[PDB]
């Protein structure tokens, strides 16, 4: 989750947030290269005192100036497609979670076997326990097992929402009359904080998401205790 004076991304937990973070470093290096090229060329080419304001050969450098940005654009594009095709492969998941975003609260169904469902509302600011996080803590944290492929189906009852957790690299639209796939994994246990990204009314800032990732035996104990 976010810390003060943070510049870059949140640190990765899922594998895909590592590959997207490395690709972000790659494309930001490319952005720095092109921006420094443009800035150094304009600062060079304003400060001269020589002049040449007559007829110039119109087409003698255009082929280079069209092939080089194509080379850098495909240099961006091939890892983009390579990681683009690495989100919807064969998963063979473990658990299936169903998340419905009702009018300013999330709801979670674990009904693979022994149908379980609960609601996630925000702990209010005046009702916070000490040490807690403002605008991010929930009533019921969403408990998932460690390092396993978890199928996740996202929708909403009424309007558009967006189930998003940044540190796992998940952001998926919640559309009524739809059902959206997201596979979620992890590598470390702990608590991950996200919040809704689609505009959904007068309390749009006020639905958080807390994912609590635990070992599988403790997930089984939590599933037995919660039902």
């Amino acid at each position: 989750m976010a810390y003060p004076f943070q510049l870059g991304l949140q640190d990765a937990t899922s594998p895909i947030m590592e590959e997207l973070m490395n690709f972000h470093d790659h494309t930001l290096m490319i952005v720095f290269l092109i921006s420094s090229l443009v800035l150094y060329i304009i600062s060079l080419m304003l400060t001269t005192k020589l002049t040449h304001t007559s007829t110039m050969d119109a087409q003698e450098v255009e082929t280079i100036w069209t092939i080089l940005p194509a080379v850098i654009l495909i240099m961006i594009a091939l890892p983009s497609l390579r990681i683009l095709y690495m989100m919807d492969e064969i998963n063979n998941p473990v658990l299936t979670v169903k998340t419905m975003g009702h009018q300013w609260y999330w709801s979670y169904e674990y009904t693979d076997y022994e149908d379980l469902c609960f609601d996630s509302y925000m702990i209010p600011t005046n009702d916070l326990k000490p040490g807690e996080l403002r605008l991010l803590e929930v009533d019921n944290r969403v408990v998932l097992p460690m390092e396993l492929p978890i199928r996740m189906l996202i929708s909403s009852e009424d309007v558009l929402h967006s189930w998003a957790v940044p540190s796992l690299g998940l952001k998926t639209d919640a559309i009524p009359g739809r059902l959206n796939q997201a596979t979620v994994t992890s590598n470390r246990p702990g608590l991950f904080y996200g919040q809704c990204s689609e505009i959904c009314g007068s309390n749009h800032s006020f639905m958080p998401i807390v994912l609590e990732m635990v070992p599988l035996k403790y997930f089984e104990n939590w599933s037995a205790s919660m039902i």
């Binding site: 001269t48 005192k49 002049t51 040449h52 304001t53 007559s54």
Partner: protein, 104 residues
């Protein structure tokens, strides 16, 4: 084209026997647009052309745009003046540096 037809065409254009002020202004206004410091016999032809149509001050700005057409490095203009000296004391034309037009 290459250097010799450019240079020969400009020195023959600036030694037109019936030249007036307008085409002299065209020549000395289009010559300073090139990525080029003008060759000293083009400047010799232009100074004699200014003398032929009986006009003084445009020759002094011809010398001035020779000086500031060079740019940063100042090994052009003393060399151009050191070649243009005999023209400069056969016509009576004065350098910009001695008239006080270079002291800002």
């Amino acid at each position: 084209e290459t250097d010799e037809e450019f240079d020969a065409r400009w020195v023959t254009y600036f030694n037109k026997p019936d030249i007036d002020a307008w085409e002299l202004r065209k020549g000395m206004n289009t010559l300073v647009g090139y990525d080029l410091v003008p060759e000293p016999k083009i400047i010799d032809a232009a100074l004699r052309a200014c003398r032929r149509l009986n006009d003084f001050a445009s020759a002094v700005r011809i010398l001035e745009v020779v000086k500031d057409k060079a740019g940063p490095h100042k090994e052009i203009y003393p060399y151009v003046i050191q070649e243009l000296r005999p023209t400069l004391n056969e016509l009576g034309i004065s350098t910009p540096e001695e008239l006080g037009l270079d002291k800002v």
